[PDB]
Design a protein around this ligand. Structure first.
Ligand code: HEX
Ligand code: HEX
Ligand code: HEX
Lengths: 248, 249
């Protein structure tokens, strides 16, 4: 098992009065085992987070970005993020895929650009309730991953992280059973092994996301192909600390 | 007898500390003695640094976009989050969001309705593409874009509403719109408002020109009767933006 990752996706949430204490708790929590922590605040809150977050085990990521600077009102580019000293980015979140027209190809574009820019990337893949019921899970996630891999060189994979978040488990409280997560993660790593080798597939981090809580993190991490979590809701609470502890 | 003018700077997806700090210093060093409302709209990421250094009394900071509510919307920023941080000005419906991000008329109207309900000053963008203009649908298009937001707003809301006409037809083809071409549309827009919403509304409504503006043509444009200012693009990331503001004197 490679170094685990505990990522917090605050999504479209937060206020100064809410984030200050939360960041404080994060700064006092001293984890000893090897673990990479990542917090993803909104663009407007990256500045204050990067100013107060002092825990050396933590890194700050953006929740999204576009490939180049220019006439794109309202968007933020990888170049602007880089000049600010941010080197982690979440791309292809299902919410962006479903609501803001981010197609497999658009996502693959963003990931390729981010990798070249030197970013560490968390790419989200995942199937919907109807896609699973129709028995198309495997086809869906592999097609999503394949579009991304097609634009990457072998060396870029060292900066790539996979996040599997079944849409039917987002903000629904319906977490996948450990066996359910294991199965898909297993599928993902095997495809990567058969395609890029054992070395890369062995070092690759596949994170699980979707109604993760301190009450089920430990059990989910027990599985051999789960390398951590991408946490939403519970990431805005001191509970996140316990979830990081479950990656021991 | 034009209302108070507005000089807005849409920095779009551009910026860096090294570029922005000297720009803010320039704007802070400038003093405008006429009644003008200035606005700078930096990327979300740069809003904090701009709010901590911006001192010019005639300037307000605005957001380049926003969504109606907070929650599970990865990558976006909501009106409430912006409000809590002390931002009360927002740009919505920009042609770039309408063309690359599928923001329809209905989506833009809900965004404006909610921004008004939250106490924001709103700059709603409207404009037709080259295809639409060539097919002779300029009026049908802009008035439809405007009618969409109008239907969602109460009368009192319009006091915090500002309109920006975007000549997408000229922008997307590299052509330059003459002052008359601009005024032809501003006039139709004010006409519609004056006969649909009120004579009081039309007299106080600011309709900014969002085409290509520079210190060279800024004065010639503002001299037109129904143009109350500008929504500046690239020229707003340079010191010449000061001259564009002065052009509204
Ligand atoms: C910049 C990627 C978003 C795609 C919108 C259609
Ligand atoms: C480069 C960002 C524009 C979005 C195109 C879909
Ligand atoms: C094609 C001419 C444009 C004028 C619209 C009022």
């Amino acid at each position: 098992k490679p170094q685990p990752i505990a990522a917090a996706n605050w999504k479209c949430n937060g206020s100064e009065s809410l984030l200050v204490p939360l960041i404080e708790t994060l700064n006092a929590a001293t984890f000893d085992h090897d673990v990479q922590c990542v917090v993803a605040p909104t663009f407007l809150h990256i500045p204050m987070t990067k100013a107060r977050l002092t825990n050396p085990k933590f890194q700050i990521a953006a929740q999204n970005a576009i490939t180049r600077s220019g006439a794109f009102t309202g968007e933020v580019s990888l170049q602007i993020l880089k000049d600010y000293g941010i080197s982690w980015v979440v791309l292809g979140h299902s919410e962006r895929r479903l609501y803001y027209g981010e197609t497999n190809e658009i996502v693959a574009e963003k990931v390729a650009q981010a990798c070249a820019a030197g970013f560490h990337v968390i790419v989200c893949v995942g199937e919907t309730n109807e896609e699973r019921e129709a028995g198309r899970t495997a086809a869906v996630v592999l097609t999503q991953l394949a579009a991304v891999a097609q634009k990457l060189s072998k060396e870029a994979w060292s900066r790539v992280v996979i996040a599997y978040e079944p849409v039917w488990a987002i903000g629904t409280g319906k977490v996948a059973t450990p066996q359910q997560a294991q199965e898909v993660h297993e599928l993902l790593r095997r495809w990567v092994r058969s395609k890029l080798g054992t070395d890369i597939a062995a070092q690759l981090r596949i994170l699980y996301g979707g109604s993760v809580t301190a009450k089920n993190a430990r059990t989910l991490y027990q599985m051999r192909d789960i390398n951590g979590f991408l946490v939403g809701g519970a990431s805005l609470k001191p509970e996140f600390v316990e979830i990081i502890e479950a990656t021991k």
